Design a binder for this molecule. Sequence first.
Ligand SMILES: COc1ccc(C(F)(F)F)cc1CC(=O)N1CCS[C@@H](C(N)=O)C1
Ligand SMILES: [Zn+2]
Length: 140
Amino acid sequence: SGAIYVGNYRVVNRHLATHNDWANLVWEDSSRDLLVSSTTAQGCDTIARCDCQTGVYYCSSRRKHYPVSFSKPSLIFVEASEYYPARYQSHLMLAVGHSEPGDCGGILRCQHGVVGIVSTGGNGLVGFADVRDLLWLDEE
Ligand SMILES: COc1ccc(C(F)(F)F)cc1CC(=O)N1CCS[C@@H](C(N)=O)C1
Ligand SMILES: [Zn+2]
């Protein structure tokens, strides 16, 4: 689990969105595994606006933050899970790192701010849904 809290937005994995998220929906995209809902309180996260390929992510199944090198956002074939059939996921970045299904939502960050959230995994790989192209997260 986990979310990004920027401005009056909450960014979560679409497959983990709650009823309150769907009832206060701003934007969702199943091909990216992302959903954004509106919040009453202002958040403290800032979004990175860069081309970094190195950063750090939070892994809840280890209680640890790990430094990683990650690929540029791309269209990647992801195997079937409990939440999606095997399909192509867009704007996904891959790295070598530990992940388990409940690690989705952990933040990936670089020197400029939040880059994305854990969305996929398996066999020593972790995939992150990028948010750096969503420029509207920075404005009301
Ligand atoms: C954090 O992800 C995992 C991590 C490890 C493994 C394992 F291979 F060990 F079974 C499997 C996963 C699950 C997975 O890839 N999912 C979770 C459901 S939503 C799906 C997607 N965004 O298409 C991504
Ligand atoms: Zn950066």
